[PDB]
Amino acid sequence: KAGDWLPGFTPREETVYVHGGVEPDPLTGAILPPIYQNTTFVQESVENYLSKGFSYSRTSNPTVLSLEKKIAEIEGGFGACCFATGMAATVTIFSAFLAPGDHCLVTNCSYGGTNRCARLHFSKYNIDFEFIDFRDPTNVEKAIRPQTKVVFSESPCNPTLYLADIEAISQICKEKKVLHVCDSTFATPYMMRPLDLGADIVVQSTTKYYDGHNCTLGGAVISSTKEIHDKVFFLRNVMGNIMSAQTAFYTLLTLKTLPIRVEKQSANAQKIAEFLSKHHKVEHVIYPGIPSFPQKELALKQHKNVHGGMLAFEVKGGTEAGIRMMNHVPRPWSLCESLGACESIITCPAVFREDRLKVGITDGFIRVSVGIEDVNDLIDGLDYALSKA
Amino acid sequence: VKAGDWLPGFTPREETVYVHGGVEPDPLTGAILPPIYQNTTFVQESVENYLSKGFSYSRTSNPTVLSLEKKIAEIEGGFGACCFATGMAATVTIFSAFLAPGDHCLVTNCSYGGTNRCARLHFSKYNIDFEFIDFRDPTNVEKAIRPQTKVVFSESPCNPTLYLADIEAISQICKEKKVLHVCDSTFATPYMMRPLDLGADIVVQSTTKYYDGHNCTLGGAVISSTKEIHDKVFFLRNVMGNIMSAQTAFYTLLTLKTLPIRVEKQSANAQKIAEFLSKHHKVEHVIYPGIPSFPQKELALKQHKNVHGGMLAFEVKGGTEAGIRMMNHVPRPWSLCESLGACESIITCPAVFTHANMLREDRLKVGITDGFIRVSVGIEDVNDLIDGLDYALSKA
Amino acid sequence: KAGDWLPGFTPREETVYVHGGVEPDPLTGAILPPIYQNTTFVQESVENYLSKGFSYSRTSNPTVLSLEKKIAEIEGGFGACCFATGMAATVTIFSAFLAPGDHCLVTNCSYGGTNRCARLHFSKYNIDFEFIDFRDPTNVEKAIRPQTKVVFSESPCNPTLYLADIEAISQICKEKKVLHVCDSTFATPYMMRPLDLGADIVVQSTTKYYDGHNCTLGGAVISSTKEIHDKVFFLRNVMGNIMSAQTAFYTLLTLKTLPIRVEKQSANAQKIAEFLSKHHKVEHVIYPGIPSFPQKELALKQHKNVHGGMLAFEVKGGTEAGIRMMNHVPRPWSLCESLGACESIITCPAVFREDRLKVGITDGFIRVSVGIEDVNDLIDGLDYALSKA
Amino acid sequence: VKAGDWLPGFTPREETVYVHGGVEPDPLTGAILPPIYQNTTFVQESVENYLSKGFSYSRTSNPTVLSLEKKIAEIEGGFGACCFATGMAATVTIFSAFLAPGDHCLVTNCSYGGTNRCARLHFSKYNIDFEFIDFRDPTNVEKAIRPQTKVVFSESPCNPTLYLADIEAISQICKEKKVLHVCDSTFATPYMMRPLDLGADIVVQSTTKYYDGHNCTLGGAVISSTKEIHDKVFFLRNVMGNIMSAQTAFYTLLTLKTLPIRVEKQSANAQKIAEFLSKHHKVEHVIYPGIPSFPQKELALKQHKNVHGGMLAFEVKGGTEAGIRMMNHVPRPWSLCESLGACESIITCPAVFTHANMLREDRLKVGITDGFIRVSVGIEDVNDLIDGLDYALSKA
């Protein structure tokens, strides 16, 4: 009847982004879930405690739970836990699955915050973090110790856009009985679902593409099994780092357009990468959709639908040229941190060294987050900025 | 030219305006989205610099609402815009500002039901004569204009029959006869049709529908062609206390950024659904401005840019019983409910849901038949949407 | 049992402010009502249309309806309708109950907006508005015509704080079969409930005291009968001027503290009025709690609990002195419009004439909205401002 | 001195600080409440003026959150404050920043259950030794300090037994032995007790409870006595990603304005309820710091300003069965649920609701008995509250 999914059918991809994890409010029929902006939940009696499923919003909240169900469906997981930020999701992984004496392999071109929270904080608990090059899966295979509990990949990596072969790394981790965690923030599940490729856990900064509007901060942990999910949920309650109901409402809203947003962003990004690869003031361009991409074979194997909204490039002249460019990049570009949004964002990490170069972050390196503006405004602005470099 | 400046002498392209129009980073903090001014009153520096920072009281104007207004005026091509609590409040403010006892007002006879009602049931008690006519032929409008006519109120496409009105032709008639042309282009969106570009004097929008597009907020907008019209609307909005709230304006500032890609996806889905329905052996008629049998095809091709919209309609064979049974059996992802324009596909019967206070005889005279079904297409996978309709039609 | 009011008992005053019109969410037990930030409501079938009570948020919304039930209980009415602003509530009254040829009596010292929306707008529909002095009920009795449909009182009046004898005016209106509408925004229902005194309709700007935090705009119409309530509700749907769910949530929150807020504000106001009445630069002080108040007998008859947070005074020296004072009133005072808030507000209407004087608004007249700051900071600041006058 | 300025050389009085602390009218518009910065990232003018307007990314700092932080630091009497998603996140950030393998940490054995758990169940796996002792006698703390002790974590009053700890005496001991004194004064609020005034090094607050006081938001705060401590907390908050959101900070900026009058009303109600319970023939024991039989009366009178708080506890005669029956029969306006501090009066059994993972033997050793009932008093009419309790007690 009306209001039911037909039994035995599974919604197709875009339908899940619109409707996944949500049904009309049973009480009123409201098409969107109400915002449970409240801390505590009244119990019918001492015996029917938790009979309606909730007690305290630090532990679980109905709006947050609806978003978690949607995210788990989109990523292909058993369940998801939502957090105040992406960093909270990551540090909850490190907190739950590592103890003194354990070993953790982390991609050496990881997002800066992940790298720092490993080196500067968790390492003081006598946890051994080792940073290696994930572009070759045999590097991971050869670096796993008996003490290794977690292999933490990221693909594409921030900011260099290196790819990690998630299926091969997952095979390696399964054989060694090690947890494979994948940060696929830059990919989004519309381009790559690491759980489909054998990862044990996915970490998402929902701040970036899930939101996509520069509106909220948020994080998510999607677990492949009930055992892992239960561990994450328990520790989230202890750490007090759950997402708020209002943030979950915003993200429930913005996730509905993730497919059409990422399609537009990636079409723009392809055109911008093609323009930059012919510009005489540009030394190198990094985009998984152009022929110069070093890991083109893996990109064709691992990416679905698109090649994403992120790109990078190196301006000729080094740091001084990159600075001149950044200082003269006009609207509609925004000069700032973050990525994944409707508003195109550009930044030069160097201005905002030996180890920097060891990563791949060269002096004139520019990270570009492509939005959904008209691509001719974006290209015209980059062309003008380059004329000052 | 430095970071934070636009290139001088360039007009930003359309999609850029949807993302950035009316909005710059916060001067104080650089926040990429301007903050929500969730506050009622504004402190003044002194008596002599009263209103020197531009604001006094949020019923009169609010900074978040004003940012949204500048963006909407830019998108619709107007001098200025006023934002309201609902689309109906926008419409009522136009009737309140531009009509007085003794005046005559031509309204499309297939107007959105609420417009028809607030005219017939409320403003008519002030001895304003509302005449409801067929706007499909602009000469009907020309020769229905009496010397008391002050306002011509068109809608295109019409809710729910999707009749079109030739906005450019009607505006030429209205300028010749010195009458105000107001056009409700809620169903079109400015991505498909901008009445101000076609000579209308005022545009009214229910931002509830496509501007929002997420079933999240209520809102309305009036976009005025001139400063004289805009100032009248603004003054009366302050008197009637029906301004939009800062929080609603923040939501709409956010959702408007994706209006082009949303409407493109909705319209692509709607074309495929209308083709599917037009071949279906249990469907009597299909109405969609983009299918080749559309009766006003030539006007649609003249007046619609990019797309033919997310709205369609159809009649199921068998009359009322079959339409009711089809409604009761349409599965998810469809939603059975009122409203339209949203990411979530919606289906309804205008006979019960919206045009219920229109007596059946007039209901039919309009075009709202027994088996008539209004469809608002969202952005789900079109194959899920068609699967659901095909199941419901097989049950009908 | 737990979760039930005991049958046959009525909650006392302050309990209604905390809990009136609201019960824990039946679905989850959430102690606060969820925010129904949604426009439309899914229907079970064509036959069970409106079976769950909602269809479209312009017509009715669950959060708004909870607030309406609370407000109706607090004011002692059959029902309430909530609006985007106080002015929307007022203009809905004028729209619903007046037609060409009708006559409307309005207090001549009404809030400026009410006066203007009558004179400048509704008068163009051939509605005859007559402004008279409501301090004497026999003025109302003698001014009622056969065409009179509405008598619109306000007590205390903005800004002069004149009182209207609501019970006597109601008796007069009942005998003439005329609708008595009362704007009791300045009083709040904690000090005066016009429905208890025989008024037919109450109008509230919830912006002022119901909110009390300078946070939201809002309005309410509380009707004494189902017939009146139904008329107001129908026209609200036509006018499209309903309150939003988010605003209703804020007001559901802030109404809980209205009694303790108004108690503190009124204690401060009494002390400030006593200070000003001894200051040599102050010509007159207007406060219903000091002995100089002209309508002291009516204030003692008509006011409950307190004498309110509003006061007024005239500085010696006229307009120039008032301006000097306003320009030198220090924090914690705020120089701005509105009233009723935690933050003390001061304004001089003259700077921000014959008819002005006809009202009672003299040149050096200052309207003071007392907040909940420490009264010694407030008095010290007024003393300093006066030293510049 | 002009409008918008404070009088120079005057310290604003306490209630004024609750209304206005940390907040001035918006410089750009004069908005009396500063807007909600609902945005993630902040645009920079150039490379060389990076962070010149003070913000870059909302995980690190946000303008609305920073306004709330300045207000909280002013109210609690600290150098600075950091705001967090929850009280538990504040507490966990303190344990994460100031403890390392091999360190010893003295915690009150009647600490709030979540604190006890995150110590025992999580941080202990890093080879941090948490020792749980009786803080009612400060010499217990003095002689329990081992040379590995880095942190002494007190709570007063304790959740749920309402035991007090002599904050000034414990701080003197901690300064003599060069150990960090952290105090959770959630149950007290700064209106009743400011641990930083009494020599504590750090205060931790669950703003969820009384700062909010309306059951609306979750939140936490860490208030630091010095710049060195504050900078450590701020740095680690950015690493752990547990900052408060702008919307929650806006809500708390609003609710904090009424904290004094709320706590005054709650505390007046609570005194009357505790007196009523102490005379009731079906009540075994009543615990409230303001009734004359309170065991730590002298410390309460030394350490509590204005009030003795909204929290009380009692045991019903008959043990577990009678307590359960009383719970199942307490009517509205009471609410049966977790949490505390709110306008809405709340009642619960810590045995099931909060301290359930504490085994019964330890449960009793603490003071959490079978018939033990924790009561959070709101601002309803006290006669309705007493009526409800009297009915429930008659059913017990």
Ligand SMILES: *Cc1c(COP(=O)(O)O)cnc(C)c1O
């Ligand atoms: C942004 C980012 C993070 C951190 O998420 P936050 O929401 O900023 O805390 C983690 N991983 C990647 C790849 C990121 O881009």
Ligand SMILES: *Cc1c(COP(=O)(O)O)cnc(C)c1O
């Ligand atoms: C929805 C609608 C309106 C009324 O707008 P509301 O936001 O519902 O008040 C007006 N015109 C059209 C064409 C509509 O569809």
Ligand SMILES: *Cc1c(COP(=O)(O)O)cnc(C)c1O
């Ligand atoms: C403020 C006010 C109004 C108008 O209410 P708004 O919410 O500002 O539209 C009406 N009556 C009185 C007495 C007022 O003070």
Ligand SMILES: *Cc1c(COP(=O)(O)O)cnc(C)c1O
């Ligand atoms: C509530 C509570 C906490 C934990 O705070 P949350 O906001 O629930 O994370 C800490 N200490 C005390 C005394 C508490 O009552």
